[PDB]
Ligand binder design. Structure first.
Ligand SMILES: [Zn+2]
Lengths: 416, 35, 210, 157, 464
C-alpha cells in the first residue's frame, strides 16, 4: 500500500483507470493502519482532475471511516458531477447544519494539531509538510450552484459581525473568533467566493485586526488567513491596495520569471505588525537599634511585634472554638533577640555569624522555643520575606522537638 | 505554533514533566486523580 | 581643551556652568575642535571603567557603609548615581548585555528601596540587600576572567574616527608643529592587577604609535 | 591617562627573573625569618632586630649587582650605566625626602634598561602621610636597602 | 487496627479524634497511624457534611491540626492525606485557611529528613488547593515552593522538577501572587540550566502565555524578563550561579550554550515570542544579530547552529573546504531508512519525487516567510557577509552555505516587494571589486561568491 504512492508521483501511464480501483479495494482492509495509509495516498491523488473524476464515478463508501474519511468525501462537492450526486440524497443540507453547531470550531483544532505536530515537540496522544485541510465552506464555492446555497442560508452575515465586534476577554469566546477567521479565509480563496465576500467590506476589517489586536495569537492567525485570500489574481490586487504584497506564481515551476497562486502574503513593511502598545507594570501603581550599642548580658543586668488575633496558631481559636488564654520580663527580652536575628538572616550577608548567635540561645535557654506564639510570628515572617533554602531549613527545624502542650490541653477539652 | 489556550498548556506541562523526568517523582506527584 | 572638559563634567553646579561658558566662546572660532573633545572624552572614560566595574565598586562601598557605619542616608546616595545611569539606556552591546543578565535584579531591588523610604520597615531594606548581594557575588566571579576588550563590544564610536584634528594627549608645545590623532587601535589589553589598568595605543599623524 | 615609559621594567620583576634562573627561591630571606620565629609580626622591637639581623647575614645580598653586569654587552657600557644609576637614585632620594614620599616598595620603583636611570611611579602617599598612619608606620626618609647599596659601587655609598 | 464500621458515624468519629491529641501520653504512634486511615475509609462512606459526621468542619480541622506536629513521618503523611479527602469546595478551603493550617503544610514541604513519601503527600495536597480555588492560594505555601525551586539544585534535591511544574500550573490561574514573590524569575532561571528538550518547551510556554493576553502583560517587565535567555550568547563571560565548582567550569559553559539554544528556538516558534523579540525599538534580535559581527570565535560557532535550527536547515559537516561541505547538504544523500530492512523504495521515493500539489497552501512556508523577513529587515544579510570575510576558514564555510540556503529559500517563498533589496549583495560585491582594500580580504569575498556559485548548481540538479 505504501508503494502505490511511488506509482502516483512518477506519472505512471493511465494510473487513473487501474490504480484508483486498486485503492478502493485496499480501503476495506482489516488492519486500520493499512486503511489509514490508503486514505493518505488517496487524498494526494485527488489533486488531479482526471483522478478526482474517477473517484466520483466509483462512488465509494467513506462514511464508515473517521474524520479522515469525512474530509476526503467533502472534496466531491468541488466537481459539478460530484455535487449533483451528493446534493441529491439530501447530504449538503445535513453537513451545513452539522458544520455549524458542532465541529466548525473543531476545524481550528485540526489546524492547531498539525502545526503543533510539525514544530512544537508536543506529540498529542527534516522539514515536514503542513497542508491546509479540506473545509466545507472552501470547497462549496468552486461552482455557482454551490455558491448560491451558501448565500441563501446567510452565514456570511453571522460571521462578519463576529469579527467587527470581538470580545477578547474570555478564552472560550476567543476560539469562536478563530472559528470565524478560518471560515472567512476559505470563502475568499475563489473568484466566485470573493464576489459575495467583498460586498460586505470585511477584508479591511481583518487587515485592521492584523495590526492592532491586543491578543497576539489572533494577530498571528490573521497572517495565515490572509494568505488564503491571496490565492487568486483578483485577491492579490485587493491586498496590494492596502500595502500587502503576495506571491503570484504556482509551485509547479519553482523558478519564477516575470511575464492558482500559492497562498502567501506579507506586509510591505514588516514592522507594521510588530508594534504593541505599552502597558505599565503592576508594581508601579526599637530593639533592633538599641541592641547594637549593648550586649545580651548587659541588658539583663508583648515582644511579638506583628502578632494580632487573626494570624496566630493558638490565639485565633479563642473566639471561634472557645480556647483559654495563654499563660506566661526575662522571657520578653529573649523573644526580641530571637526575632531580630531572623531578619538579619534574610540578607545572607553574614550567615555564619547569625546562625552562631541563634544556636547559643537554644543551648543556654532551650525553653524559649517552646511557645506557639513565637512559632506563628516566625512562620508569618517566613512568608513575607525571602530566605535561602539552606537558611530556610535551619529555621522551622529548631522547633522540631517541642511538645506545644497548650494546644493539646485546649483541643482535648473543646472536642470532648 | 498555537499553544494559546490553557487547556492544551496544562496538558503539555503535565505530560512533558512525567515523560522526561529521570527521577521517579513526577510520575508519582502529578497523578491525574487530584485533577 | 583638556582641563575644560574635566571641569565641564564636574558634579558641582558652579564649575559646570562656568566651564560651559568658556567652551561656547571657543565654539565661535573653533567649533569642530570642542565637539571632537567631548566625544573622545566621553568614550575614554566609558572604556576606563565598565558597567560591571562601577557596580562592583559601588556595592562594595555601600555594603561597608550599611554594616560598618550603620548609615542608611549614606548608603542610598552611593547607589543613586549608579541606578540613574541605567534609566538612560544602553548605548553599546556590552551595556545591552549587562542590562539583560543583571537588569531585572537591580531594577527590582531599587523598588524595595523605594518602599523603605515610605514604610520604614527594616524588612524592606533587608529584602533589598538580598538582591544587591546576589548580583555582587556573580560579578565578583567574572572580574578575573576579564583580560581583553574589543572596541566594537565596548564603544563603537572610537574605531570609526579614522581622523581627528585633536592633538595626542600630553604632547603640545607652542614651538613645535603639532601632532594629531589619526586612528585608535581596534583592540586593547587589560593588565591583571587590583585596579586593572588598560593599555590604549593611539596613532600619530606622523606614523608614530603612542 | 598616564603615559607609557618604554624600555623600563619594575625592580621586583627584575630580581624575580634573576633568582628563578639561578634556582633560588624568591623569598629565601622571608622563609628564614618565619622558620626562626613564626610569630614575627607580633615580636617586640628588640626581638625583631635579632630575627632581621640573622637573615641578612645568612644570605649575601648581591642580586642586583650581578644582574646589571650580565645584561651589559661590554664593560665600557656597564660602567657608564652604573654611573647614571648611582646619581639618579641620589637625586630622587633627596627630592623625595622634601616631598615626603612614602610607600616605595619595589613594585613602585622602575629601572631603565638602556640608560640605567631610576624612575618613580605612584605618587599617592605624599607629605609624610605614611609616617603618621596607625597601621605599620614607616620611619625612614627614603628607600636605601642593602640590595641597592651593594650595586652602586664596591666602596659603598 | 480494627475498622468498626458498626456504630453511628459520630460514635466512630469520636475515637480517632480523641487518640489524635492523646496529650502525648498513653497512645502510641502506631495506633494513631492506623486510626487516621480509619477516618479516610469512613469519609469515603459518609459524604462531606456537618450533619451526619458529628461535629462541624472547624472542629475536625482542629484535631487534624495536631497530626502534622508529630515526630513520625508516617503519621504526618497520613494526616496530610486526610485533608486532601476533606477539602472539596471553597467553603471548606476558606475554613482550612482561616485556622492558619498553611503554616504547617509549608512546614512539611521543606524538612528534608529522608521523608520522600511524606513530601509527595504534601505536594499532592497543594495541587488540590489550586484546583478548588486558585484565587485564595496562601502566600505562605507559595514562598516555600519558590525557595525549593530557586535554590534546589546545589543541595541535590530530587523533588526539584516536581515543584517547578506546580508553580507553572499556579502561574496560569493566579499570576498575582506568583509575581510578587518572584515566581516568574524562577522559571526564567530554570530554563538556563535545564537541558531536557521536552521540559524546556513547557517552561518557556508558560511565560509566553502571560505575555499573550492583554490583561496579563502587566506582570512581566519590558526588556529584562524575556531577554534573559539571550544572556549566554550576548555576554562573553556569563556566570549563572554565584557558587559552583571550578572543575567543571568548561563543561558548564557548554551546558549553558545547549540549554539556551533550546530556549531561543522555543520562543521563535510562538506568536507571542516573535512579536516580543522583534519590537520596533531596541529588541533582543538586534542584540543577537549585532553580536554576530564581533570577531569572536566561540560565539560565532554557537550562533550559526542556532540559525540553522531556526530555519530547520540540514547541518553540514565540519571541514575547511567547500566541496566537502557541499556534498553533505544535498537532498539526495543516502539515509538509513532506505535499506531493504527498512522501507525499501517507498521511503526513498518520498524525499526525491515531488509532491503532486501545485495549489494547496503550505502553512509552514507562511511561517518561514515571516521569520525570514524579520531577520532581513534587522540586517541579517549584512551581518553574514561580515562573518564570511572576517572569520576562520572552517566558520566561513558554514556561513557560506547558510547564505546560499537563505537566498534559495527567499526566491521561492518571499513576495515580489521583499525581493528588491535582496538578491543584489551590495556589501559583498563592493569588497570584491575594490583594489584599495587589503588584497587578502578581496579574494576571500571573491572566492566566497565563487564557492556560493556552485551551490545553485547543486539545487539546479535537484534530488537524484
Ligand atoms: Zn498568639
Amino acid at each position: 500500500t505504501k508503494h502505490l504512492r511511488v506509482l502516483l508521483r512518477a506519472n505512471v501511464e493511465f494510473f487513473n483507470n487501474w490504480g484508483i480501483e486498486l485503492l478502493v479495494t485496499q480501503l476495506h482492509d482489516k488492519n486500520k493502519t493499512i486503511s489509514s495509509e490508503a486514505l493518505d495516498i488517496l487524498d494526494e491523488a485527488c489533486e488531479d482532475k482526471a483522478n478526482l473524476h474517477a473517484l466520483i464515478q466509483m462512488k465509494p463508501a467513506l462514511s464508515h471511516l473517521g474524520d479522515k474519511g469525512l474530509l476526503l468525501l467533502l472534496r466531491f462537492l468541488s466537481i459539478p458531477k460530484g455535487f449533483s450526486y451528493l446534493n441529491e440524497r439530501g447530504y449538503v443540507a445535513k453537513q451545513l447544519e452539522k458544520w455549524h453547531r458542532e465541529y466548525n470550531s473543531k476545524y481550528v483544532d485540526l489546524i492547531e494539531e498539525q502545526l503543533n505536530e510539525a514544530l512544537t515537540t508536543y506529540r498529542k496522544p527534516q522539514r515536514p509538510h503542513v497542508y491546509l485541510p479540506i473545509h466545507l465552506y472552501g470547497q462549496l464555492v468552486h461552482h455557482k450552484t454551490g455558491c448560491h446555497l451558501l448565500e441563501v442560508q446567510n452565514i456570511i452575515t453571522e460571521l462578519c459581525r463576529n469579527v467587527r465586534t470581538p470580545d477578547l476577554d474570555k478564552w472560550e469566546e476567543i476560539k469562536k473568533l478563530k472559528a470565524s477567521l478560518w471560515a472567512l479565509g476559505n470563502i475568499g480563496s475563489s473568484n466566485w467566493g470573493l464576489n459575495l465576500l467583498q460586498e460586505e467590506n470585511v477584508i479591511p476589517d481583518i487587515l485592521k485586526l492584523a495590526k492592532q489586536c491586543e491578543v497576539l495569537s489572533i494577530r498571528g492567525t490573521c497572517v495565515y488567513v490572509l494568505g488564503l485570500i491571496a490565492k487568486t489574481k483578483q485577491g492579490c490586487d485587493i491586498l496590494k491596495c492596502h500595502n500587502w504584497d503576495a506571491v503570484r506564481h504556482s509551485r509547479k515551476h519553482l523558478w519564477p520569471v516575470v511575464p492558482d497562486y500559492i497562498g502567501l502574503a506579507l506586509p510591505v513593511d514588516i514592522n507594521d505588525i510588530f508594534q504593541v502598545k505599552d502597558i505599565p507594570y503592576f508594581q508601579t501603581k526599637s530593639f533592633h537599634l538599641l541592641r547594637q550599642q549593648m550586649s545580651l548580658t548587659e541588658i539583663m543586668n508583648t515582644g511579638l511585634q506583628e502578632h494580632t488575633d487573626d494570624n496566630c496558631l493558638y490565639c485565633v481559636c479563642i473566639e471561634i472554638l472557645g480556647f483559654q488564654p495563654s499563660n506566661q520580663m526575662c522571657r520578653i527580652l529573649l523573644r526580641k533577640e530571637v526575632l531580630r536575628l531572623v531578619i538579619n538572616l534574610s540578607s545572607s550577608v553574614s550567615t555564619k555569624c547569625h546562625e552562631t548567635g541563634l544556636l547559643t540561645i537554644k543551648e543556654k535557654y532551650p525553653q524559649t522555643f517552646d511557645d506557639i506564639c513565637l512559632y506563628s510570628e516566625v512562620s508569618h515572617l517566613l512568608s513575607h520575606c525571602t530566605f535561602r533554602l539552606p537558611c530556610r531549613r535551619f529555621i522551622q527545624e529548631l522547633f522540631q522537638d517541642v511538645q506545644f502542650l497548650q494546644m493539646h490541653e485546649e483541643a482535648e477539652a473543646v472536642l470532648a | 505554533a498555537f499553544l494559546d489556550n490553557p487547556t492544551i498548556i496544562l496538558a503539555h506541562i503535565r505530560q512533558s514533566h512525567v515523560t522526561s523526568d529521570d527521577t521517579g517523582m513526577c510520575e508519582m506527584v502529578l497523578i491525574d486523580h487530584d485533577v | 581643551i583638556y582641563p575644560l572638559t574635566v571641569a565641564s563634567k564636574s558634579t558641582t553646579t558652579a564649575r559646570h556652568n562656568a566651564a560651559n561658558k568658556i567652551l561656547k566662546n571657543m565654539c565661535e572660532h573653533s567649533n569642530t575642535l570642542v565637539q571632537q573633545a567631548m566625544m573622545v572624552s566621553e568614550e575614554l572614560i566609558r572604556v576606563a571603567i565598565l558597567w560591571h566595574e562601577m557596580w562592583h565598586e559601588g556595592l562594595e562601598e555601600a555594603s561597608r557603609l550599611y554594616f560598618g557605619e550603620r548609615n542608611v542616608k549614606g548608603m542610598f546616595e552611593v547607589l543613586e548615581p549608579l541606578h540613574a545611569m541605567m534609566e538612560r539606556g544602553p548605548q553599546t552591546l556590552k551595556e545591552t548585555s549587562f542590562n539583560q543578565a543583571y537588569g531585572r535584579d537591580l531594577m527590582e531591588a531599587q523598588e524595595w528601596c523605594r518602599k523603605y523610604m515610605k514604610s520604614g520597615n527594616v524588612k524592606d531594606l533587608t529584602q533589598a540587600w538580598d538582591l544587591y548581594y546576589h548580583v555582587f557575588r556573580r560579578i565578583s566571579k567574572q572580574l578575573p576572567q576579564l583580560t581583553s576588550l574589543e572596541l566594537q563590544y565596548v564603544s563603537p564610536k572610537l574605531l570609526m574616527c579614522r581622523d581627528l584634528e585633536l592633538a595626542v594627549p600630553g604632547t603640545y608645545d607652542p614651538n613645535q608643529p603639532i601632532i594629531r590623532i589619526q586612528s585608535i587601535a581596534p583592540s586593547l589589553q587589560v593588565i591583571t592587577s587590583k585596579q586593572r589598568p588598560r593599555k590604549l595605543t593611539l596613532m600619530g599623524s606622523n606614523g608614530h604609535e603612542f | 591617562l598616564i603615559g607609557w615609559v618604554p624600555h623600563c621594567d619594575t625592580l621586583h620583576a627584575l630580581i624575580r627573573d634573576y633568582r628563578e634562573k639561578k634556582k633560588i627561591l624568591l623569598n629565601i630571606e622571608h622563609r628564614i625569618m618565619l622558620r626562626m620565629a613564626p610569630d614575627y609580626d607580633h615580636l617586640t622591637l628588640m626581638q625583631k632586630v635579632e630575627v632581621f639581623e640573622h637573615a641578612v647575614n645568612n644570605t649575601a645580598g648581591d642580586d642586583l649587582a650581578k644582574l646589571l653586569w650580565l645584561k651589559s654587552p661590554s664593560s665600557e657600557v656597564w660602567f657608564d650605566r652604573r654611573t647614571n644609576y648611582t646619581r639618579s637614585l641620589a637625586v630622587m632620594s633627596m627630592v623625595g625626602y622634601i616631598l615626603g614620599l612614602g610607600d616605595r616598595h619595589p613594585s613602585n620603583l622602575m629601572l631603565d634598561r638602556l640608560s640605567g636611570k631610576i624612575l618613580h611611579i605612584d605618587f599617592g602617599d605624599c607629605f609624610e602621610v605614611a609616617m603618621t598612619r596607625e597601621k605599620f608606620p614607616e620611619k625612614i626618609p627614603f628607600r636605601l636597602t642593602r640590595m641597592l647599596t651593594n650595586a652602586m659601587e664596591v666602596t659603598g655609598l | 487496627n480494627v475498622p468498626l464500621d458498626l456504630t453511628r458515624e459520630p460514635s466512630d468519629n469520636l475515637r480517632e479524634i480523641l487518640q489524635n491529641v492523646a496529650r502525648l501520653q498513653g497512645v502510641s504512634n502506631m495506633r494513631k497511624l492506623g486510626h487516621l486511615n480509619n477516618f479516610t475509609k469512613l469519609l469515603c462512606d459518609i459524604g462531606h457534611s456537618e450533619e451526619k459526621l458529628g461535629f462541624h468542619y472547624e472542629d475536625i480541622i482542629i484535631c487534624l491540626r495536631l497530626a502534622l506536629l508529630n515526630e513520625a513521618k508516617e503519621v504526618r503523611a497520613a494526616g496530610l492525606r486526610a485533608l486532601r479527602y476533606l477539602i472539596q469546595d471553597s467553603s471548606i478551603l476558606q475554613k482550612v485557611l482561616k485556622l492558619k493550617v498553611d503554616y504547617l503544610i509549608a512546614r512539611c514541604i521543606d524538612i528534608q529528613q529522608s521523608n520522600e513519601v511524606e513530601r509527595t503527600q504534601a505536594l499532592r495536597l497543594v495541587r488540590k488547593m489550586i484546583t478548588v480555588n486558585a484565587s485564595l492560594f496562601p502566600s505562605s505555601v507559595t514562598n516555600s515552593l519558590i525557595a525549593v525551586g530557586n535554590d534546589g539544585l546545589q543541595e541535590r534535591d530530587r523533588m526539584v522538577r516536581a515543584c517547578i511544574a506546580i508553580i507553572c500550573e499556579l502561574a496560569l490561574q493566579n499570576p498575582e501572587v506568583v509575581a510578587l514573590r518572584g515566581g516568574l524569575n524562577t522559571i526564567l532561571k530554570n530554563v538556563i540550566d535545564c537541558q531536557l528538550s521536552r521540559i524546556n518547551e513547557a517552561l518557556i510556554t508558560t511565560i509566553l502565555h502571560l505575555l499573550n493576553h492583554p490583561k496579563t502583560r502587566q506582570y512581566v517587565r519590558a526588556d529584562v524578563e524575556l531577554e534573559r535567555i539571550l544572556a549566554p550568547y550576548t555576554d562573553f563571560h556569563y556566570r549563572h550561579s554565584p557558587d559552583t565548582a571550578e572543575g567543571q567550569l568548561k563543561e558548564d559553559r557548554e551546558a549553558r550554550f545547549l540549554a539556551s539554544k533550546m530556549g531561543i528556538i522555543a520562543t521563535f516558534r510562538s506568536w507571542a515570542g516573535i512579536i516580543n523579540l522583534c519590537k520596533p525599538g531596541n529588541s533582543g534580535i538586534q542584540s543577537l544579530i549585532g553580536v554576530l559581527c564581533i570577531p569572536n570565535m566561540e560565539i560565532r560557532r554557537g550562533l550559526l547552529e542556532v540559525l540553522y535550527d531556526i530555519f530547520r536547515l540540514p547541518l553540514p559537516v565540519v571541514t575547511e573546504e567547500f566541496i566537502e561541505a557541499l556534498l553533505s547538504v544535498d537532498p539526495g544523500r543516502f539515509q538509513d531508512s532506505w535499506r531493504l530492512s527498512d522501507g525499501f523504495v517507498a521511503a526513498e521515493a518520498k524525499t526525491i519525487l515531488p509532491h503532486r500539489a501545485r495549489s494547496r497552501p503550505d502553512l509552514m512556508d507562511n511561517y518561514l516567510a515571516l521569520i525570514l523577513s524579520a531577520f532581513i529587515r534587522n540586517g541579517l544579510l549584512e551581518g553574514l557577509v561580515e562573518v564570511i570575510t572576517n572569520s576562520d576558514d572552517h566558520i566561513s564555510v558554514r556561513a557560506t552555505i547558510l547564505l546560499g540556503e537563505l537566498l534559495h529559500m527567499a526566491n521561492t517563498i518571499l513576495p515580489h516587494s521583499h525581493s528588491h533589496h535582496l538578491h543584489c549583495l551590495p556589501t559583498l560585491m563592493n569588497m570584491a571589486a575594490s583594489f584599495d582594500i587589503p588584497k587578502e580580504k578581496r579574494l576571500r569575498a571573491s572566492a566566497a561568491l565563487n564557492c556560493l556559485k556552485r551551490f545553485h548548481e547543486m539545487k539546479k540538479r535537484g534530488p537524484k
